[PDB]
Paper text:
CtPPase is a small β-strand protein containing a core five-stranded oligonucleotide/oligosaccharide-binding (OB) fold. CtPPase has the prototypical family I pyrophosphatase (PPase) topology. Family 1 PPases are ubiquitous in all kingdoms of life. The overall topology of CtPPase resembles an open fist (or baseball mitt) with the substrate-binding cavity sitting in the palm, while β-strands form finger-like structures surrounding the active site.
The CtPPase structure was refined to 2.25 Å resolution in space group C2221 with three molecules in the asymmetric unit. Surface-area calculations by PISA suggest a hexamer as the most likely biological assembly. Electron density modeled as an Na atom was observed in the active site of each monomer. Despite the addition of pyrophosphate to the crystallization buffer, no density was observed for pyrophosphate or phosphate ions. Inspection of the solvent-accessible surface of CtPPase reveals a medium-sized cleft that partially occupies the fragment-binding site of BpPPase.
Residue numbers in the entry:
A (entry chain C): 4 to 209
B (entry chain A), C (entry chain B): 3 to 208
The structure:
C-alpha cells in the first residue's frame, strides 16, 4: 500500500512492453508561458525560467521516468554522430508527446508510444528529444515511425529549440546556432536511446 | 507527526469527520479537460487514462473518495437495490461528481463537499455508482441538501455524459441498447450508505 | 541517494540558499483561479479552502514560504515595527505575493522569487504579513530590488484585494471600518528579517 505520492522521475514504471509504450511525465504544455522543470530534490514541478522571447512549446514536453542521460547515452550519441568525448547532459531523457487534444496543465503522467527522436548536441553534451504520440490519440495515435509524422509538426518542434534562446542580435547577425541538430531517427533507434538512458539511470539509482 | 512527503490522494486524506455529512474529495477531471484523467493507484500521480473519444466534456468536477473501494459490499448492495444478481464492484475508488458554480480548471486537488444523492449505474454487471455532492459553501449549490432539490437540467447533463462519452456513432445510428445502465437516482441517506459501504470495502481490503 | 516520494511543499523544499536574496516559493493561488486554494497541512495536497465570496481575483501569484511559521518571534517583530503590543503570529506559513508579467494559470508549483518588501497586516492582534517578491528573471519585474521601485498601481491592486475579498456589500454601504489593518509597507532588508524570523519560528517548532 503506497502511503505517499511517488517522485515522478523515480516512481513510475518506464515501460511494460519492451519500450513499445512509455509512461511519461509532462512538465510543459503549449499553454505555458514559462518553462517548467521537475525539481529533482523535491519532485514538485518548478518554474525554471519565463519564456525569454516569443515562443510557446509546440507539444507536450517532459521527461521519461527512470532515465538519465549519462555515460552510455553520451557514447552512443557520440558514435551515432561520429563524435568523440560526447557526454550525457545529466538530466532525465527529454520526450515530446504529440496529441491533438488540449492539455493545459503539466505535472501529469500519460502513456505515449515512441516513433523517433531528434539527436541534438549542445556543446559536447547529448540533448536528445524523443518524439512520441499519445496512446489512443485520435490524430497521431496510429503513427508508428517518425517518417509517418507530418513534417510541419517536426519543423515546428525544431524551430522551437532553434529560436527559444536566440537573441535578436544573434538572429540579425546570422550567428551560427548554439545547438547542433544532427538529424532525426526512427522508432527502433529511439527505443535504443531510451534503453541506454534507462541503463544509465538503473546503474546510478538502482 | 510531521509529514515530510505528500500523502497518496486515495489512501491519505480522512474521508469524513462528521459521519458523512461532508466529505473530502480528490478531483481528477474538470469541465476544462479534454482528456479523461485518473489517479494512478501505484504512484498517486494524476495520469491520462485516455483522450475523450468523442464530443464530450465532463460537466462537473469528477473525482474519487479517499479510503473507498467498490468491492464486495458495494456490489451486493447495488445488486440488492437494483434487484439484479451477480453484481460486482468495479474495483476502483468510489466516484463522486461535485457541483459548483465556480470555474475550476485544474484537477489534482482536494475539496470538501456534501453528498446529496447519487446515480446507480450498472456497467455489464458491475456497480458504477456516481455520488452527487455540492461544493461546501458554494454560492449556488451550497445550501442544496438532497438530490430532489438539484435542478433536473444539471442531472440530465450528468446522466447524458455517462450515457454518451463511450457511445460510438454506429451504436447510436443502429439504436443498439446502451452499454451502461442508469438504474435510477437516489437521495442523501442512500448515498451516505453507499459511501459507508465503499469505505468498509476499503478498510477490509487494507 | 534517491528521493522516492514527492516532498511536502511546506516541510520539504529548502527555503533559501543565498541568505534570503532569493526564495523558493510554493504557489497556491494564481489570478486565473476563482476559488481560494490552500495547502492542506496534513496531506500536503493542494485543497480548496472556499470559493471566492465576491467579485475578486487574486492579483498575483500567492502562496507560502517553505520552512516558515508565523509564530512568536514573527509576532514580536510585527508588534515592535507597528508600535502595538501583544501581537501574536497567525499560526500558518509566511504568505508571499510574487509579481510576474507572465501568465501562470495553475498553482501547486514551486518557483524562485526575490523579495523586495512586504505588507504588514494586523488581523485582530495577529500578524498577517504579506511578503512581496518578484519572479526571478521576469521580463518586467526581474530587476526590481526594493518595493519603492514597484509600480504603486500593482501595490494598490494587491492592497485592494485583501481589503475587499471578504467585505460584504452591507459593510461597504454602511462604511463599517475595515476588519483587517494595513499598517504599511516595508523594504527589502526588513522583509528578509521577517522571513528570517519566520524561518526561526519554524525551526524552533520542530
Ligand atoms: Na535534456
Ligand atoms: Na467507477
Ligand atoms: Na499569514
Amino acid at each position: 500500500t503506497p502511503l505517499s505520492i511517488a517522485h515522478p522521475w523515480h516512481g513510475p514504471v518506464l515501460t511494460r512492453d519492451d519500450y513499445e509504450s512509455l509512461c511519461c511525465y509532462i512538465e510543459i504544455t503549449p499553454a505555458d508561458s514559462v518553462k517548467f522543470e521537475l525539481d529533482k530534490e523535491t519532485g514538485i514541478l518548478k518554474v525554471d525560467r519565463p519564456q525569454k522571447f516569443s515562443n510557446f512549446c509546440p507539444c507536450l514536453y517532459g521527461l521519461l521516468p527512470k532515465t538519465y542521460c549519462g555515460d552510455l547515452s553520451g557514447e552512443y550519441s557520440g558514435q551515432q554522430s561520429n563524435r568523440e568525448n560526447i557526454k550525457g547532459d545529466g538530466d532525465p531523457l527529454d520526450i515530446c508527446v504529440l496529441t491533438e487534444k488540449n492539455i493545459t496543465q503539466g505535472n501529469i503522467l500519460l502513456q505515449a508510444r515512441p516513433i523517433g527522436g531528434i539527436r541534438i548536441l549542445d556543446s559536447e553534451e547529448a540533448d536528445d528529444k524523443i518524439i512520441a504520440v499519445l496512446e489512443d490519440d485520435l490524430v497521431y495515435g496510429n503513427i508508428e515511425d517518425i517518417s509517418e509524422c507530418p513534417g510541419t509538426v517536426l519543423d515546428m518542434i525544431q524551430h522551437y529549440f532553434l529560436t527559444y534562446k536566440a537573441t535578436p542580435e544573434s538572429l540579425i547577425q546570422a550567428k551560427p546556432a548554439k545547438i547542433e541538430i544532427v538529424g532525426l531517427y526512427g522508432k527502433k533507434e529511439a527505443q535504443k536511446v531510451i534503453r541506454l538512458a534507462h541503463e544509465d539511470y538503473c546503474n546510478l539509482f538502482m
